[PDB]
Amino acid sequence: VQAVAVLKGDAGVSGVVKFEQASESEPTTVSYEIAGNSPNAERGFHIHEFGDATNGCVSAGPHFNPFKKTHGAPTDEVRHVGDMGNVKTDENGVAKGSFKDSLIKLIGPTSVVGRSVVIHAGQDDLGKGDTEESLKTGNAGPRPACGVIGLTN
Amino acid sequence: VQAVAVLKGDAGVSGVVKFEQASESEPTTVSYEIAGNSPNAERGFHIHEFGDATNGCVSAGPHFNPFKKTHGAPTDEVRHVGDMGNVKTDENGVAKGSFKDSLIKLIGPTSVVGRSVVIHAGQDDLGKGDTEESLKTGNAGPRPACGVIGLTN
Ligand SMILES: [Cu+]
Ligand SMILES: [Cu+]
Ligand SMILES: [Zn+2]
Ligand SMILES: [Zn+2]
Numbered sequence: 001v002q003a004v005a006v007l008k009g010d011a012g013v014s015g016v017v018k019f020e021q022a023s024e025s026e027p028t029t030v031s032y033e034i035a036g037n038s039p040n041a042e043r044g045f046h047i048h049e050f051g052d053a054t055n056g057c058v059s060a061g062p063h064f065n066p067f068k069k070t071h072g073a074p075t076d077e078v079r080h081v082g083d084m085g086n087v088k089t090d091e092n093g094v095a096k097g098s099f100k101d102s103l104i105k106l107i108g109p110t111s112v113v114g115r116s117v118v119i120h121a122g123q124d125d126l127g128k129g130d131t132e133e134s135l136k137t138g139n140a141g142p143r144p145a146c147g148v149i150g151l152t153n
Numbered sequence: 154v155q156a157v158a159v160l161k162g163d164a165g166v167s168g169v170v171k172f173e174q175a176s177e178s179e180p181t182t183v184s185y186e187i188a189g190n191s192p193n194a195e196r197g198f199h200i201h202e203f204g205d206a207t208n209g210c211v212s213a214g215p216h217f218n219p220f221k222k223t224h225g226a227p228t229d230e231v232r233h234v235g236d237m238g239n240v241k242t243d244e245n246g247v248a249k250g251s252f253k254d255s256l257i258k259l260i261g262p263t264s265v266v267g268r269s270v271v272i273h274a275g276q277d278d279l280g281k282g283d284t285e286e287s288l289k290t291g292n293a294g295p296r297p298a299c300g301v302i303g304l305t306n
Pocket of ligand 4: 199216223224225233235236289290291
């Protein structure tokens with residue numbers, strides 16, 4: 001199964017995120033190329049619950065969290081399903097990379113097809129700050145771009 | 154279950170299409186409001202197979218057709234699942250309306266979540282012209298706007 005999200009917004013940030021998963025038990029490979037970010041930075045990257053673009057990136061809602069856990073890093077046990085951590089941008093502000101994840105799925109009751117990917121304007125603190133807010137969003141800040149995850153071939 | 158697609162493009166046409174279906178057996182209610190079209194016209198309106206926006210409305214692919222039938226009107230027995238016919242635009246070029254459909258589903262193996270809605274620049278001939286092309290696209294022409302169907306609440 002393959003899926004893709006095209007990230008768009010009004011702030012100069014844009015990109016493509018591709019997902020591939022062969023079967024339900026297998027990890028999903030996530031690959032991305034995002035440009036227009038601050039150079040040499042770490043930026044929060046997550047799957048949000050809704051694929052609703054009627055009000056910019058706001059209507060994407062909270063981090064996708066079917067299991068009602070707190071925000072964490074992708075390697076934490078306690079993490080939202082949608083937590084993909086920070087992506088690193090190079091000196092031209094481009095973030096490009098790929099990783100495998102075993103909580104994100106394109107198949108089955110937790111499928112992220114039809115939901116949204118959001119790239120943030122700030123660094124995700126990976127649920128390690130103080131605030132209650134660190135345990136909800138990682139204090140990653142505004143959402144300059146986002147896209148609905150759709151099926152492809 | 155509710156879903157929404159925001160139709161966008163570079164041609165002045167834009168809109169929102171909402172879908173609601175309570176359970177798998179129930180009809181899905183489709184409601185839309187699309188502006189920027191030719192005034193007093195009929196325009197082809199369909200669900201296309203892929204929710205891929207990497208190349209405008211082109212990468213949405215063909216009409217969603219899991220059962221391998223020919224193109225038809227929404228009331229025809231032989232019709233693609235994605236065939237929603239023509240929408241009528243008023244004197245200000247706005248198409249606004251709603252209908253129920255029993256082939257389009259948001260639940261189950263034929264779910265349209267993660268696929269695309271496309272509004273065409275021409276009238277759909279409802280598979281009644283001559284050509285082979287009438288039995289494939291309804292000769293509805295270019296795709297000025299489209300959007301991926303995403304989940305909402
Ligand atoms: Cu986020
Ligand atoms: Cu079409
Ligand atoms: Zn989170
Ligand atoms: Zn068709």
